[PDB]
Design an enzyme around this catalytic site. Structure first.
Site, PDB file in Angstrom:
ATOM      1  N   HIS A  81      -2.085   1.229  -2.019  1.00  0.00           N
ATOM      2  CA  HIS A  81      -3.273   0.704  -2.715  1.00  0.00           C
ATOM      3  C   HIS A  81      -2.932  -0.052  -4.003  1.00  0.00           C
ATOM      4  O   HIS A  81      -3.723  -0.867  -4.480  1.00  0.00           O
ATOM      5  CB  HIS A  81      -4.324   1.812  -2.927  1.00  0.00           C
ATOM      6  CG  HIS A  81      -4.143   2.616  -4.179  1.00  0.00           C
ATOM      7  ND1 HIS A  81      -3.665   3.907  -4.178  1.00  0.00           N
ATOM      8  CD2 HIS A  81      -4.413   2.316  -5.474  1.00  0.00           C
ATOM      9  CE1 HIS A  81      -3.635   4.364  -5.420  1.00  0.00           C
ATOM     10  NE2 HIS A  81      -4.081   3.415  -6.226  1.00  0.00           N
TER      11      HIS A  81
ATOM     12  N   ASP B   1      -1.701   6.007   2.405  1.00  0.00           N
ATOM     13  CA  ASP B   1      -1.480   5.359   1.116  1.00  0.00           C
ATOM     14  C   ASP B   1      -0.010   5.459   0.682  1.00  0.00           C
ATOM     15  O   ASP B   1       0.357   6.230  -0.200  1.00  0.00           O
ATOM     16  CB  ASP B   1      -2.415   5.965   0.069  1.00  0.00           C
ATOM     17  CG  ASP B   1      -2.563   5.102  -1.170  1.00  0.00           C
ATOM     18  OD1 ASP B   1      -2.070   3.960  -1.187  1.00  0.00           O
ATOM     19  OD2 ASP B   1      -3.181   5.579  -2.146  1.00  0.00           O
TER      20      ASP B   1
ATOM     21  N   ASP C 127      -4.926  16.630 -14.358  1.00  0.00           N
ATOM     22  CA  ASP C 127      -4.933  15.762 -13.178  1.00  0.00           C
ATOM     23  C   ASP C 127      -4.007  14.564 -13.409  1.00  0.00           C
ATOM     24  O   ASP C 127      -3.608  14.290 -14.537  1.00  0.00           O
ATOM     25  CB  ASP C 127      -6.357  15.267 -12.912  1.00  0.00           C
ATOM     26  CG  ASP C 127      -6.577  14.757 -11.489  1.00  0.00           C
ATOM     27  OD1 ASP C 127      -5.692  14.914 -10.613  1.00  0.00           O
ATOM     28  OD2 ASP C 127      -7.670  14.186 -11.243  1.00  0.00           O
TER      29      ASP C 127
ATOM     30  N   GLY D 106      -3.300   4.508 -13.215  1.00  0.00           N
ATOM     31  CA  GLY D 106      -2.051   4.136 -13.833  1.00  0.00           C
ATOM     32  C   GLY D 106      -0.903   4.998 -13.343  1.00  0.00           C
ATOM     33  O   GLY D 106       0.240   4.558 -13.387  1.00  0.00           O
TER      34      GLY D 106
ATOM     35  N   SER E  59      -0.899   6.186 -10.180  1.00  0.00           N
ATOM     36  CA  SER E  59      -0.835   5.879  -8.750  1.00  0.00           C
ATOM     37  C   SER E  59       0.539   5.414  -8.334  1.00  0.00           C
ATOM     38  O   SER E  59       1.176   4.641  -9.037  1.00  0.00           O
ATOM     39  CB  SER E  59      -1.849   4.798  -8.383  1.00  0.00           C
ATOM     40  OG  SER E  59      -3.157   5.326  -8.402  1.00  0.00           O
ATOM     41  N   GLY E  60       0.994   5.900  -7.187  1.00  0.00           N
ATOM     42  CA  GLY E  60       2.320   5.553  -6.696  1.00  0.00           C
ATOM     43  C   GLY E  60       3.446   6.453  -7.159  1.00  0.00           C
ATOM     44  O   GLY E  60       4.512   6.447  -6.567  1.00  0.00           O
TER      45      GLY E  60
HETATM   46  N1  LIG Z   1      -5.590  12.398  -9.195  1.00  0.00           N
HETATM   47  C1  LIG Z   1      -6.791  11.618  -9.097  1.00  0.00           C
HETATM   48  C2  LIG Z   1      -6.514  10.139  -9.175  1.00  0.00           C
HETATM   49  C3  LIG Z   1      -5.332   9.591  -8.683  1.00  0.00           C
HETATM   50  C4  LIG Z   1      -5.113   8.222  -8.780  1.00  0.00           C
HETATM   51  C5  LIG Z   1      -6.079   7.404  -9.355  1.00  0.00           C
HETATM   52  C6  LIG Z   1      -7.258   7.957  -9.842  1.00  0.00           C
HETATM   53  C7  LIG Z   1      -7.469   9.321  -9.753  1.00  0.00           C
END
Ligand SMILES: NCc1ccccc1
Ligand SMILES: [Ca+2]
Ligand SMILES: [Cl-]
Ligand SMILES: [Cl-]
Lengths: 250, 58
Positions: free
Chosen positions: A41, A90, A182, A186, A188-189
């Protein structure tokens, strides 16, 4: 990363920072000297595929300390089953144009065998997630690399404890439902890394959630064990002209 | 022994074989010790190890 801590410099040596035209795009994970695993993504809105850069050995984005190694991304490989704008499948495999040099600050994470990952790693409760993403929902991104310990949930339990995309067999849940901790935009990946008997392994990719640190919800991660054979086959393959490659999955 | 229980006693990877047989294996950059289960690095920067911490306890 929300509710974590600074990863001491060199303690997350497989972390990759992906840049487009110098701007932070996403994270990634080094798995050997020329290959990086990230999230599909991350590449949905890329216009010029030739301005993608991967940085290894990064820590504090405000400075240059000489441990950083930048490479052009020569190939971005995405499974045929991934549909832009959606959550399933993903994962992306990135070929660097030139290998990185392994050092105290640049080290690959082990890509585990599928059986080991499914039978053993999947039952290790806590794993580390890291990145330079947002420190709060609707907040500024981190200048120093952050890291967070998150517990994994069985999908049945995630669905029961949560209160919208499905959680598929190509995903897993991890984290907390109280809004305190969490991975975020930013991140992501980036890696979800799992320790077993003295060694760390790639088990997940920061993928999605209902916002970041949303009460009643957990982080969702790509289940890397489903892709081991797909990744290994591609790493044995010769490069092809043109950066983006869609490769059949399974 | 069997790989689904206790990782078959292996430090890293495990294969079940025909009979009451099991073989442990190690990732590239590691070799299997004579105990048949443990993996030791064969290179300076093996995957999944953090140099500054490995030195911190060396
Ligand atoms: N862990 C929740 C999340 C992951 C990637 C982008 C937004 C939210
Ligand atoms: Ca820096
Ligand atoms: Cl080929
Ligand atoms: Cl191209």
């Amino acid at each position: 990363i929300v509710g974590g801590k600074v990863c001491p410099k060199g303690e997350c040596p497989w972390q990759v920072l992906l840049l487009v035209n110098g701007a932070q795009l996403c994270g990634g994970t080094l798995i050997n000297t020329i290959w990086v695993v990230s999230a599909a993504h991350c590449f949905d809105k890329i216009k010029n595929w030739r301005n993608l850069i991967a940085v290894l050995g990064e820590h504090d984005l405000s400075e240059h300390d000489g441990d950083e190694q930048s490479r052009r991304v020569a190939q971005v490989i995405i499974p045929s089953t991934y549909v832009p704008g959606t959550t399933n499948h993903d994962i992306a495999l990135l070929r660097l144009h030139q290998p990185v040099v392994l050092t105290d600050h640049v080290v690959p994470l082990c890509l585990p065998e599928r059986t080991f990952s499914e039978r053993t790693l999947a039952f290790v409760r806590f794993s580390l997630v890291s990145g330079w993403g947002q420190l709060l929902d609707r907040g500024a991104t981190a200048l120093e690399l952050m890291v967070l310990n998150v517990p994994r949930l069985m999908t049945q339990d995630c669905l029961q404890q949560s209160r919208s995309p499905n959680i598929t067999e190509y995903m897993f849940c991890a984290g907390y439902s109280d809004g305190s901790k969490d991975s975020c935009k930013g991140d992501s990946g980036g890696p979800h890394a799992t320790h077993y008997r003295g060694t760390w392994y790639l088990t997940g990719i920061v993928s999605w959630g209902q916002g970041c640190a949303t009460v009643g919800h957990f982080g969702v991660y790509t289940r890397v064990s489903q892709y081991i054979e797909w990744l290994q086959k591609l790493m044995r393959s010769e490069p092809r002209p043109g950066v983006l490659l869609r490769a059949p999955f399974p | 022994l069997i790989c689904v229980n206790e990782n078959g006693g292996c430090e890293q990877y495990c294969s079940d074989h025909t009979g009451t047989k099991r073989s442990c294996r190690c990732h590239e950059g590691y070799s299997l010790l004579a105990d048949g289960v443990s993996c030791t690095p064969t290179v300076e920067y093996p995957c999944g190890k953090i140099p500054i911490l490995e030195k911190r306890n060396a």
